Amino acid sequence: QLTEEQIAEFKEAFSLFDKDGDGTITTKELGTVMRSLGQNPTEAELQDMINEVDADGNGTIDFPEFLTMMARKMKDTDSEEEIREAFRVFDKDGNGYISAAELRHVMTNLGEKLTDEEVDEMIREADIDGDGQVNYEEFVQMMTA
């Protein structure tokens, strides 16, 4: 739906990361840019920032799935990052699920005091797997309504 000039500008922006004209971004090409900018990442976070946007999964990023990433980082504030990162403070152990302990601690003790029965009812309503473990999918669904 974009015009020709926008497509050309986005191709020029892609050329910063592509360097050689293979057509895809790998973990060894974004790392060079990040090192040139002063940061010193490692392979774990390099793969973590790449598998986030890969719509199918090949270890590389193409232009159609780069436009999706760049349609989110151009706005004044992206509403997905502060929902993906306001979820890891509810996940202290790091297994990937919100157990009753972390929620009953953070929601009630901190911030506005919440009733234990109300917290349990909210957890039961939010949970869709029925295992008592709130996951990222249910968290995002509840916060997006």
Binding site: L2, E9, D76
Partner: protein, 360 residues
């Protein structure tokens, strides 16, 4: 995406509305300087031409109030587009509804034509309140710079998490060309203040206090070289003179910092200077270390012949040649120590690279 093609339109419609509200404000400000310095030099004779300027001012104010609200209504659309909303009732906060009111109050103060070279007390404040319209400059400057829509630039500004606001652009402009902007603002602030004070302390009986007497008081107050031949005589003229001195001190501090930073050697010339001074010191030491032996041998010969008046004369030159040798020795040692210490920001890199090459 469909939500990315509209951000390039709703933001370009804010670039021709934040710049066309800066010309209807310049025109409004430029028509009070006439209504003041034509009422002063004129009077009741030109009572027909003073009923047109005061109406053009009102027309310009009405055409500016119809653009400020359009600009503020073109941003609620951006807020709705970014967050995916359809009900405009939620995109309007409780502070944006007061900022608009404050802006419309500030940008609506003009000497309306509701109808003796002296402006009234209730009119010289409405006339001087037009200068508050200068808050539209950063808004019109930020939207025009090509660092807000460059997809090749935000892409790298997001991997380091820097925010593009009114301060980053100002710092960039300051670093690119410091001196010209500084001199421009310094010479542009000496012409507005010289009129704001002249409209405040002018009098007719003595024909004194106009621009000819305020173009001289303002600079010497700014530089804190107050002589005392001309001084303000009104309460409203004693506040401008106090506001000028603070800006003078701040500009002096900024100039001191800039001058301190500007002048210095860089590495590429420091290394050349050290290398080309070492050779001169080496030559001087070798030249100095020959007179010691020359007068030593000459004194030995003269005491062999027992002149008893030239041996004592040449024993006075050896003791000075030794001191001259010592001075050059100390200078060369100091320069060698500095050279061995100056090259320490890349010596570690070189030696660590050599160690890494040796390893594995």
């Amino acid at each position: 995406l469909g939500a990315l093609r509209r951000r390039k339109r709703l933001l370009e419609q804010e670039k021709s509305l934040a710049g066309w509200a800066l010309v209807l404000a310049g025109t409004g400000i430029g028509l009070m300087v006439l209504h003041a310095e034509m009422l002063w030099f004129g009077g009741c004779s030109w009572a027909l031409y003073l009923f047109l300027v005061k109406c053009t001012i009102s027309i310009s104010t009405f055409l500016l109030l119809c653009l400020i609200v359009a600009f503020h209504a073109k941003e609620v659309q951006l807020f709705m587009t970014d967050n995916g909303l359809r009900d405009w009732r939620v995109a309007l906060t409780g502070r944006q509804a007061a900022q608009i009111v404050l802006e419309l109050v500030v940008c609506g103060l003009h000497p309306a034509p509701v109808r003796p070279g002296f402006l009234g007390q209730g009119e010289a404040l409405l006339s001087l309140a037009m200068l508050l319209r200068l808050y539209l400059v950063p808004r019109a400057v930020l939207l025009r710079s090509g660092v807000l829509l460059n997809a090749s630039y935000r892409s790298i500004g997001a991997l380091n998490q820097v925010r593009f606001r009114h301060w980053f652009v100002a710092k960039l402009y300051m670093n690119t060309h410091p001196g010209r902007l500084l001199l421009g603002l310094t010479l542009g602030l000496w012409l507005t203040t010289a009129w704001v004070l002249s409209v405040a302390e002018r009098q007719a009986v003595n024909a004194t206090g106009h621009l000819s007497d305020t173009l001289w008081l303002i600079p010497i107050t700014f530089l804190t070289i107050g002589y005392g031949d001309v001084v303000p005589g009104t309460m409203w003229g004693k506040i401008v003179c106090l506001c000028t001195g603070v800006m003078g001190v701040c500009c002096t501090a900024l100039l001191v910092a800039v001058v301190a930073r500007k002048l210095e050697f860089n590495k590429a010339e420091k290394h050349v200077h050290n290398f080309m001074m070492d050779i001169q010191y080496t030559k001087e030491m070798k030249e100095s270390a020959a007179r010691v032996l020359q007068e030593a041998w000459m004194f030995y010969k003269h005491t062999r012949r027992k002149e008893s008046h030239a041996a004592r004369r040449h024993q006075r030159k050896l003791l000075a040649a030794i001191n001259a040798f010592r001075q050059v020795r100390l200078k060369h040692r100091k320069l060698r120590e500095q050279v061995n210490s100056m090259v320490d920001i890349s010596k570690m890199h070189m030696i660590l690279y050599d160690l890494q090459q040796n390893l594995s």
